[PDB]
Design a protein around this ligand. Structure first.
Ligand SMILES: [Zn+2]
Lengths: 103, 143, 127, 67, 135, 78, 112, 37
RNA sequence: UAAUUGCGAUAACGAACGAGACCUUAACCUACUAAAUAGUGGUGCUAGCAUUUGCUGGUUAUCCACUUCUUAGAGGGACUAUCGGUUUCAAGCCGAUGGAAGUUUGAGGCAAUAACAGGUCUGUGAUGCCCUUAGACGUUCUGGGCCGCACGCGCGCUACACUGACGGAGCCAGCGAGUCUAACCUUGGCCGAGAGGUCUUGGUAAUCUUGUGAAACUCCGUCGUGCUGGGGAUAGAGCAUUGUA
């Protein structure tokens, strides 16, 4: 009997939501008790970059961006279900994390 | 329909409680008060040299009643003085912690504040009773 | 289950949530009365939803308000808008429809921001 | 100038040229009609074309056009 | 507060510690006039001599002037700690002093002539300074 | 071990970037298509999607060893 | 402004609002001048300023005159603002705004 | 120095990446930094 | 016409890439579909004050419901809509109205094209230069520099106050960032005028710092137009911190 918390972090929402809905429906279709995929605020990391490369012309400015989305799902299952689901769900772009403790 | 601190104006309540501490006379007052400025971001010491320690004990009591628990650092942030650095612009300077800490020890010794397990100075039950009573009085003077 | 109605109010990223339930008739912003606002000048603004429709409309409702974000002015506008909104919503769900609409008429006649939030969102600096 | 790019004007021209019947003065039905008769890759450009077929439909009910 | 009226009594220009003090300014900013004593020092000294500063400098007796001049020369015996003093922890004597109006300049010359007799960078730069800038 | 989350993920992006660069530069005559790095509990698996593996896996497997050590020696893996 | 209104009341004036409005009415220049070309040495054509800019220029001359008076004197701004608004409520040529209005209309008159 | 082009100059020493701005602008797309706005 | 953008006239008629546009973003959604790493209300456990219902809290799980506020989306949504001026009454322009949003609601990346002695590759080839090496272009080790001050030039910061300074109290944000094989962001308790010290602690973080209790600002006082209590240059003595210094 293991009560585990899972947290995903990704920049591409399609792969992240693919993995999220996969884990959701795969966790309920074999009867588990869970808290649905809770959605943390998409943090938008921006980088201010000067328009001027060569010292010609006045100084005006620009901006680069990244959107980082994070989800979390809570579950209760044995050791084998967690191992197998963690091995099966591995995807590129999406970063999965499995924590066992509840403190 | 009860008399409390959450009903009165601040400048009235602190006038009150200051007069209470000034006439009752039962507090713990240190000898540096007649010398000390309340913040490093200060140019001159307080104008009420003989009854401002009770003004700060009052402001503190009323500010600890209003929430869970606060430390001496939150009092440095509350006292919080804006300091000029000459040709340099104004900064936020934390105030003296001796005034705050000794205010807390002198209001704990007399039974108005109490150190709470969340490591923070919490308003005591007798502090609640007495502050709400003097709030009743401040509401009686207007009647 | 006391008949309650929750309505918010926004001004320049300052929000005020207003909980209008059925009580003896008490009006409080942040656990402090509406009589003692931080700005002493902007005071009357927070009064304007109480005066524009009569001072009796409140004898049946206890109104709560909590304000986060912004400064002092932003939150004054937030709480007066939250007050007006909470009033006309309690009057929509509980009192009849004509009372609620005479209330929104009374509100819109003087300040059309009492029912609609501020439409001057902070400009993107345009790089 | 909100001058509609040549794709919008040309598509409006053609859509009214063969499907004059089912289009009216209303954009809301010309839109879903532009969904059921045409295959436009974007919703925005489809709102563009269907809206310009709406304006043009308001211009053809008064007189004969160059089409 | 209280409109209390006194016929005469106050003088216009007084003098203490061989320095001129003008009597219609508050006592703090009347004592600030001299060298060696500023706003904050006159404030603390007039909190120590137990003189009411909200009462102007035209309302002060000579009995208060004797206490003030007393605290001038014994600031460590009236409980004004060593942090408050201009010349504290002197190298010449190992004590703490608060220097007055005509003595601050003599202490300055003592200091710069200390650095000149030793021949430090400060001395040479100071003297070559004054010399060449003045010439 | 232990780098801040954003810095961890960005440094993993830099890692994939640099190994993709090195593998495009090295296996140019082995029809190199791409790479995929899988982080596992014990070891790290750098899979080389290269459309001519008979050369990447040379005599006795040598050209793979020679590569791993490289991707080891500069990146300082145990 | 609330202080100023507290002063105009204790200045024996029953309606401070009508005092201010009459100041605004009295201090807005009817006709003005413009620096039109004319060929190098630019003469000044007498124009007739708009009611909008009349009110604008009025409030302007008022606030500016009052601030220009309340600078470096002990009087508070509300008292020279009430002072200005009352010397201009019923123009007395002791106010700044009536001065400047009369001079603008005078040079507008001389230049036609 | 910039761990790409032998350059003491331009260094973005932030986050421990240490690429000069010129090379970091190029490697930006391979690192993860893309043009949004 | 914003435009060689089109209508029209026409020994010219096609067709390509320019312009637009493709691309990435904003503000409304009490309607979806969804929450102890966000919050609200109700309920219990519980404190104080009034007591006549009431008021202000404590309880990171005592439970329940919500997303109205926060937040991942999906949709929608705008099409210059509608009306009127203006224009060959042709593509369009302009005013009003409605609209979350109607200057192209507003920002910028993507080409092909024809111009570049522009930067380096630590790419290569018996390739033309000076020599070839006691040269220091290599290393090091100390200590000085980069600020040194008649001045010219410029970006600024603080100011000449009384819509102000000082002294009392009120007390409201958002963008961030933060420690491993290390010492980062740091609550709180004691010592200290302060600066700081000391004993602990939470947080690798929507969980802790942190509600970043920010300042201008609000209010109650001191001063009163005096280079003043405006201004805080320059200079003296002390006390501590960062750092091998
Ligand atoms: Zn580089």
């Amino acid at each position: 009997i293991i009560k585990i918390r899972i947290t995903l972090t990704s920049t591409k929402v399609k792969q992240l939501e693919n993995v999220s809905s996969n884990i959701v429906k795969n966790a309920e279709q074999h009867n588990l008790v869970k808290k649905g995929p809770v959605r943390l605020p998409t943090k938008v990391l921006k980088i201010s970059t000067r328009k001027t490369p060569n010292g010609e012309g006045s100084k005006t400015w620009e901006t680069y961006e990244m959107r980082i989305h994070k989800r979390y799902i809570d579950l209760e299952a044995p050791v084998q279900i967690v191992k197998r689901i963690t091995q099966i769900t591995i995807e590129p772009g999406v970063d999965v994390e499995v924590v066992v403790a509840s403190n | 329909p009860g008399v409390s601190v959450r009903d009165v104006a601040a400048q009235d309540f602190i006038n009150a409680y200051a007069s209470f501490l000034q006439r009752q006379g039962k507090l713990e007052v240190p000898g540096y008060v007649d010398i000390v400025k309340t913040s490093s971001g200060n140019e001159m010491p307080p104008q009420d040299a003989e009854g401002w320690f009770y003004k700060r004990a009052a402001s503190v009591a009323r500010h600890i009643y209003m929430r869970k628990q606060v430390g001496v650092g939150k009092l440095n942030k509350l006292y919080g003085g804006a300091k000029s650095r000459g040709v340099r612009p104004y900064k936020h300077i934390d105030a003296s912690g001796s005034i705050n800490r000794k205010v807390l020890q002198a209001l704990e010794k007399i039974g108005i504040v109490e150190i709470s397990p969340k490591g923070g100075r919490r308003i005591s039950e007798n502090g609640q009773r007495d502050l709400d009573r003097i709030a009743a009085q401040t509401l009686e003077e207007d009647e | 289950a006391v008949p309650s109605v929750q309505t918010f109010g926004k001004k320049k990223s300052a929000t005020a949530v207003a909980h209008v339930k059925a009580g003896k008739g008490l009006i409080k912003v942040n656990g402090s009365p509406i009589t003692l606002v931080e700005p002493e000048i902007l005071r009357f603004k927070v009064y304007e939803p109480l005066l524009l429709v009569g001072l009796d409309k409140f004898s049946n409702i206890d109104i709560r308000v909590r304000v986060t974000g912004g400064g002092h002015v932003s939150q004054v506008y937030a709480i007066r808008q939250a007050i007006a909104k909470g009033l006309v919503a309690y009057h929509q769900k509980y009192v009849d429809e004509q009372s609620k609409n005479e209330l929104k008429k009374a509100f819109t006649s003087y300040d059309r921001t009492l029912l609609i939030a501020d439409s001057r969102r902070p400009e993107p600096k345009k790089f | 100038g909100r001058v509609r790019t040549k794709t919008v004007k040309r598509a409006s021209k053609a859509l009214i040229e063969r499907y004059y019947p089912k289009l009216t003065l209303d954009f809301q039905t010309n839109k879903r009609l532009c969904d059921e008769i045409a295959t436009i890759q974007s919703k925005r450009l489809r709102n563009k074309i269907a809206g310009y077929t709406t304006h043009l439909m308001k211009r053809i009910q008064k007189g004969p056009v160059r089409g | 507060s209280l409109v209390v009226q006194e016929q005469g009594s106050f003088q216009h220009i007084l003098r203490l510690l061989n320095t001129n003090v003008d009597g219609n300014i508050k006592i703090v900013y009347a004592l600030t006039t001299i060298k060696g004593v500023g706003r904050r020092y006159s404030n603390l000294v007039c909190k120590k001599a137990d003189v009411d500063l909200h009462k102007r400098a035209g309302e002060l007796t000579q009995e208060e002037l004797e206490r003030i001049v007393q605290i001038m020369q014994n600031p460590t015996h009236y409980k004004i700690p060593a942090w408050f003093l201009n010349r504290q922890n002197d190298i010449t004597d190992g004590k703490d002093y608060h220097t007055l109006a005509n003595n601050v300049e003599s202490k300055l010359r003592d200091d710069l002539e200390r650095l000149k007799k030793i021949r430090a960078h400060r001395g040479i730069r100071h003297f070559w300074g004054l010399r060449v800038r003045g010439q | 071990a232990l780098i801040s989350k954003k810095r961890k993920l960005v440094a993993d992006g830099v890692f994939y970037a640099e190994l993709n660069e090195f593998f495009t530069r090295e296996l140019a005559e082995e029809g190199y298509s791409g790479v995929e790095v899988r982080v596992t509990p014990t070891k790290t698996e750098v899979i080389i999607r290269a459309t001519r593996t008979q050369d990447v896996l040379g005599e006795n497997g040598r050209r793979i060893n020679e590569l791993t050590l490289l991707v080891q020696k500069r990146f300082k893996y145990a | 402004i609330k202080h100023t209104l507290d002063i105009i009341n204790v200045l024996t004036d029953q309606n401070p609002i009508q005092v201010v409005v009459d100041a605004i009415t009295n201090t807005g220049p009817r006709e003005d001048t413009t620096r039109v070309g004319g060929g190098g040495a630019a003469r000044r054509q007498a124009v007739d300023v708009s009611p909008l800019r009349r009110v604008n220029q009025a409030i302007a001359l008022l606030t500016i005159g009052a601030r220009e008076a309340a600078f470096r004197n002990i009087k508070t701004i509300a008292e020279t603002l009430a002072e200005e608004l009352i010397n201009a409520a019923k123009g007395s040529s002791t106010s700044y705004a009536i001065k400047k209005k009369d001079e603008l209309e005078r040079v507008a008159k001389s230049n036609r | 120095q910039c761990r790409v082009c032998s350059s003491h100059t331009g260094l973005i020493r932030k986050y421990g990446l240490n690429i000069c701005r010129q090379c970091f602008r190029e490697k930006a797309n391979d690192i993860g930094f893309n043009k949004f706005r």
